[PDB]
């Protein structure tokens, strides 16, 4: 009864009923099974990739609006916990090593660069060398929209995705593409990765890596200019769509060994 009460409150008490939410611990570590846990992910992934194929929501206008969800809240594509490991993981997915920090929607718009939490609470309004985030770089629809993990200790917005660049929207492009575009547009800019009065915050993009066993092994042994928070696994083909999706998977580094059944070096 008191056991029945706890179980009920742990496993059946949710405001937004997100499947495998990372607001609760990995299902593989919970003593209670939520009704919001699902050991299944592939079917839902296949189903979503099908849906993406026939794009029936105009995004070009969403990108400018910000310069399908309302104001500045829940605009970021958020991962489920990685549970049901894709049988074609190594061929069809890539891993981004994430920094300890805070997620941020970043909107560079007419002479300024403002950061938002998933909640839409604006955290800062500042200046940036991003196509729309400077008084000198403030123009007719040259707005850009990023998805960043902000690391306060290195005072840098680590770039995780790009949804819009110099007025070009990418919501409807695959991840391989988007990540390719960010790694190509970023270094094209006067010392972003540096500190200037005009650019208070450094914007470094995050490397992604293949997910073959040997590749993951390498990844885990690399050294990063930050403290490693976790591993995001993106399906190469997923478009950018705000919300929880099983097309991206999250694990903390100590989990990779167990859930992916792969080797690991010292750590």
């Amino acid at each position: 009864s008191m056991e029945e009460l706890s179980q009920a409150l742990a496993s059946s008490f949710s405001v937004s009923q997100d499947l495998n939410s990372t607001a609760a611990p990995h299902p593989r570590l919970s003593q209670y099974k939520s009704k919001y846990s699902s050991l299944e992910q592939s079917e839902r992934r296949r189903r979503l990739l099908e849906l993406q194929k026939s794009k029936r929501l105009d995004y070009v206008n969403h990108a400018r609006r910000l310069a399908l969800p309302k104001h500045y809240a829940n605009q970021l594509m958020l991962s489920e916990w990685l549970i049901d490991v894709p049988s074609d993981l190594g061929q069809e997915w890539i891993v981004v090593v994430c920094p300890v920090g805070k997620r941020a929607l970043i909107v560079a718009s007419r002479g300024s660069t403002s950061a938002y939490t998933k909640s839409g609470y604006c955290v800062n309004r500042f200046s940036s060398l991003l196509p729309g985030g400077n008084r000198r770089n403030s123009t007719a629809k040259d707005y850009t929209i990023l998805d960043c993990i902000y690391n306060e200790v290195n005072q840098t917005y680590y770039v995780l995705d790009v949804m819009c660049w110099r007025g070009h929207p990418f919501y409807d492009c695959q991840t391989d593409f988007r990540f390719y575009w960010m790694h190509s547009k970023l270094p094209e800019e006067e010392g972003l990765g540096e500190k200037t009065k005009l650019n208070p915050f450094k914007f470094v993009g995050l490397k992604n890596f293949p997910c073959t066993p040997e590749s993951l092994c390498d990844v885990l042994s690399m050294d990063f200019p930050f403290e490693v928070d976790g591993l995001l696994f993106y399906h190469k083909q997923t478009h950018y769509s705000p919300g929880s999706t099983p097309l991206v998977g999250w694990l903390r580094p100590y989990m990779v060994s167990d859930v992916l059944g792969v080797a690991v070096p010292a750590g």
Binding site: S1, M2, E3, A23, G120
Partner: protein, 958 residues
């Protein structure tokens, strides 16, 4: 312009036009300012005008004239206008037209007859005067058929009922006349009822049968106008002011009557039906929407509940048995109309009262109350009463009874409450709906720590859910999650902290290990609450070394950024001019302030880690701030980067303050934190311009003084050097400029005075002079707060200076006289009489000194004389100069009375106020100002008897 030079209006108003409102304003002036043969001519003339006038457009000048007649009466009547009352009857008792206005005038006069023994005496002495007023009324009620007159009469009766002798009310036919001839009738029915309720309020031992009759006859008439099957709730909202006020009056009647006289009706077994009928009404009115109406109903229910609780107080006693037929309906009303809990002074009260009533009722029958609640819950699941408003109210009421049941009953109850709401959440469709529910669940849970402390797995389940919700982006669920988390942490500390429960580690360990995972989606304000919450937990760790380790792990994240900033500063000082770095230091400090607040003394391991760096950053930003101002001036304070640095300084001071006041090792504070602080802040404060001076420098001095006393007396010279003069200038040219800096200055002064007195001798005389000027300014200021503080310091300085004979005499000789001059100057003047009671104690003390021969040498050094004579004269002298009107015979006698009342304070107070009583009656409007002091000390006895009666009631305070 013109109204400057009596004689004019007597002539002016005779052939005047519309400009007559000036002539009336001129006459009112003369009368209210100076007040035989002259004004005796004025009285006669004034009365003549109205007698003429009122025997319709004229209406506005009538009231204007009536006004002044009352203005004079306030000064003349009755000691030097004894006929007035015998006269005014005569006039009216013959002319109806005249009778109208006299009623209007007597109503106006009673509004200057609005202190308990003072009024008791008036009711005794002026007994004759009232007797006649009542009889005038009687006669008018008895015979007139001039409606507008009869109304005005009734207005006057009401207005006088508390002053007319008892027998006229109860041994007459008043009660019956009022009920039959008047209550009965639409345009008279409101006033009628007010009168009857006024009567019902009378609290005596006799007239028992007359009260009982007053009950049954009024009920009888009421049941005829608003019959007991009316929908009062709807009648009120629709119907006109007329019918609204009648409903208000009805409840006012039943409530007044029953509160004072219920017991009478309870005993009279033939009166149940009618007793029940009164409750019926109270329930019907309790349905009314409006708050002001509910407040009276609620006062009634609280009375009923408290009586029965005091009879009972278990879960059948005789008075309870009477009310069982309708008690559950009161339970129902509280539950279904529970006010928003304290989570303005009126609304807090409103909730407190409703809680109180419900907690009483819950003790009477907990099973009934639980059942009402379970069922109100069912109806949220039903959808039959589903609404955000309704669910919230229910949950507030559930929360409100939180100590009233026994553990075991509580447990059973909460288990169904939580399950059912959990169910309700899974069942409702919105993200909106679910958020409303989830907050309510968390609200309830937070009101019942007793339940949480009893069951670890559940507590832990709840805290984990709260961490889960700290990621919810829906409207306010992150806020309710933090707010709940801090309540639970505060009320369950020990359960987290390095005491394992049915398992392997303390839970605090798991929290400290996943802090960034938990808080990474919160915003600053929420992170701070999270930190504060975790502080309480750590505060509960009794083992010091285990607790050091907790604080370190706890404080690790902000320390990372901190360390990174400091390193950058070390390599390049200019980093501290960087807008973002400065914004970061601000928040790292604010997190420190918040954790320190929660942890208290042991936070030292942290504060000590960062102290010298922090203080160094303080100096650097200080050098920045001032050099910025030294190249652009004052306006730089306006700039955002300056505000930003100033926040660092401020949070630095607040953090230090916060720790010191919570500190528990004055040697440590003294020999280790005090010096570096003092170096970093004092000279800085001095050399800065008035605009660039942090007020918290003052409050931080004040705190470390209050905390260390003797341990820092030695440093006070250094502190006053840098801080004392310049701060005074800043506030001395009053023009209220730095409210924070004065509230602080004086808090520091009062501290040095209380705990560091010896320091005043170690400061040069020129600076002690200043201390006195500054204390003098304080008790000389307008706003009571500042005055009251200044007095307090002075009074303590006096008692304190006495302790050092050598320098006692220097002081007395130098300042003694000058201080009375100034104090009397505050008592004598156009009086801000805020601290009359203080004045009393001060003067009393100072008189004693001379009387008791403690001022060893003479104050007049050229004409040596017993100081008690010198003072007796010097005061009389100073008084006869502030009051040149006063007769030199009264002065001598009063100054004699004072010194013969010195070694006694209460009587010395009454003696002095009485001087001002009789001497402000040669003025006017004063009375209630000097009386204001006594008044408050009756509210705090009403609070103390209330608040301490609540201690016996389980759940009324919890």
């Amino acid at each position: 312009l013109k109204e400057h030079p009596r004689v004019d209006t007597i002539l002016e108003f005779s052939q005047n036009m519309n400009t007559k409102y000036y002539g009336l304003q001129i006459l009112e002036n003369v009368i209210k300012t100076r007040w035989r043969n002259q004004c005796e001519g004025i009285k006669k003339y004034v009365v003549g005008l109205i007698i003429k006038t009122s025997s319709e457009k004229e209406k506005v000048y009538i009231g204007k004239l009536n006004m002044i007649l009352v203005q004079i009466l306030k000064q003349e009547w009755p000691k030097h206008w004894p006929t007035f009352i015998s006269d005014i009857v005569g006039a009216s008792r013959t002319s109806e037209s005249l009778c109208q206005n006299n009623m209007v005038i007597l109503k106006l006069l009673s509004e200057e007859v609005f202190t308990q023994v003072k009024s008791k005496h008036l009711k005794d002495s002026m007994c004759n005067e009232f007797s006649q007023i009542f009889q005038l009324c009687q006669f008018v009620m008895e015979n007139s058929q001039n409606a507008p007159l009869v109304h005005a009469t009734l207005e006057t009766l009401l207005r006088f009922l508390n002053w007319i002798p008892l027998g006229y009310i109860f041994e007459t036919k008043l009660i019956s006349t009022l009920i039959y001839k008047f209550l009965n009738v639409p345009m008279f029915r409101n006033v009628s009822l007010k009168c009857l309720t006024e009567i019902a309020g009378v609290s005596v031992s006799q007239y028992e049968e007359q009260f009982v009759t007053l009950f049954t006859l009024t009920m009888m008439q009421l049941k005829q106008m608003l019959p007991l099957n009316t929908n009062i709730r709807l009648a009120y909202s629709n119907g006109k002011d007329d019918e609204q006020n009648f409903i208000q009056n009805l409840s006012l009647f039943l409530c007044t009557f029953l509160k004072e006289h219920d017991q009478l009706i309870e005993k009279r077994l033939n009166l149940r039906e009618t007793l029940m009928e009164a409750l019926h009404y109270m329930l019907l009115v309790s349905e009314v929407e409006e708050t002001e109406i509910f407040k009276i109903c609620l006062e009634y229910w609280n009375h009923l509940a408290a009586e029965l609780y005091r009879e009972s107080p278990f879960s059948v006693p005789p008075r309870r048995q009477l009310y069982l037929p309708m008690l559950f309906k009161v339970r129902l009303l509280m539950v279904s109309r529970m006010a928003k809990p304290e989570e303005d002074t009126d609304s807090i009260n409103l909730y407190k009262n409703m809680r109180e009533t419900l907690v009483y009722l819950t003790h009477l029958d907990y099973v009934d109350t639980e059942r009402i609640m379970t069922e109100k819950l069912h109806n949220q699941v039903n959808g039959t009463e589903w609404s955000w408003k309704n669910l919230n109210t229910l949950c507030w009421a559930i929360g409100s009874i939180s100590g009233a049941m026994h553990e075991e009953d509580e447990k059973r109850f909460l288990v169904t409450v939580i399950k059912d709401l959990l169910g309700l959440c899974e069942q409702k469709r919105g993200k909106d709906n679910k958020a409303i529910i989830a907050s309510n669940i968390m609200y309830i849970v937070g009101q019942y720590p007793r339940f949480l402390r009893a069951h670890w797995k559940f507590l832990k389940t709840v805290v984990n859910k709260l961490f889960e919700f700290m990621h919810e982006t829906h409207d306010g669920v992150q806020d309710m999650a933090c707010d709940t988390f801090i309540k639970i942490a505060q009320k369950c500390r020990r359960h987290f902290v390095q005491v394992q429960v049915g398992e392997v580690m303390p839970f605090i360990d798991e929290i400290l290990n996943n802090i960034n995972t938990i808080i990474c989606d919160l915003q600053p304000q929420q992170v701070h609450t999270f930190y504060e919450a975790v502080g309480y937990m750590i505060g509960a760790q009794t083992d010091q070394t285990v607790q050091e380790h907790l604080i370190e792990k706890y404080m690790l994240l902000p320390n990372q950024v901190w360390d990174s900033i400091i390193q950058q500063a070390t390599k390049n000082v200019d980093i501290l001019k960087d807008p973002e770095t400065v914004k970061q230091l601000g928040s790292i400090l604010k997190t420190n302030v918040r954790a320190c607040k929660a942890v208290g003394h042991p936070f030292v391991i942290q504060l000590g880690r960062i102290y010298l760096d922090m203080l160094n950053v303080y100096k650097c930003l200080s050098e920045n701030i001032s050099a910025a101002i030294q190249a652009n001036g004052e306006m730089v304070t306006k700039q955002p980067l300056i505000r930003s640095m100033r926040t660092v300084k401020r949070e630095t001071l607040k953090l230090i303050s916060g720790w010191v006041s919570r500190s528990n090792d004055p040697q440590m504070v003294a020999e280790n934190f005090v010096p570096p602080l003092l170096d970093a802040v004092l000279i800085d404060y001095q050399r800065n311009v008035p605009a660039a001076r942090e007020p918290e420098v003052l409050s931080t001095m004040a705190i470390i003084v209050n905390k260390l006393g003797g341990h820092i007396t030695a440093e006070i010279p250094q502190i006053f050097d840098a801080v004392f003069e310049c701060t005074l200038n800043m506030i001395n040219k009053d023009f209220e400029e730095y409210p924070e800096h004065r509230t602080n200055f004086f808090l520091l002064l009062q501290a040095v005075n209380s705990h560091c007195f010896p320091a005043f001798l170690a400061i040069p005389p020129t600076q002690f002079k200043l201390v006195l000027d500054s204390i003098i300014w304080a008790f000389k200021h307008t706003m009571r707060n500042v005055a009251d503080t200044g007095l307090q310091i002075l009074f303590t300085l006096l008692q304190n200076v006495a302790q050092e004979e050598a320098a006692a005499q220097s002081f007395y000789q130098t300042y003694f006289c000058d201080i009375l001059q100034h104090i009397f100057s505050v008592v004598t003047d156009t009086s801000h009489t805020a601290g009359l009671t203080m004045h009393a104690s001060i003067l009393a003390y100072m008189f004693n000194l001379v009387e008791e021969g403690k001022i060893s040498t003479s104050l007049n050094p050229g004409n040596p004389v017993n100081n008690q004579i010198f003072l007796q004269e010097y005061v009389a002298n100073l008084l006869k100069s502030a009051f040149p009107h006063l007769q030199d015979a009264q002065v001598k006698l009063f100054v004699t009375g004072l010194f013969s009342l010195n070694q006694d304070i209460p009587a010395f107070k009454e003696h002095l106020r009485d001087f001002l009583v009789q001497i402000k009656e040669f003025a006017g409007e004063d009375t209630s100002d000097l009386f204001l002091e006594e008044r408050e000390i009756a509210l705090r006895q009403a609070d103390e008897e209330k608040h301490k009666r609540q201690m016996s009631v389980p759940g009324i305070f919890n």
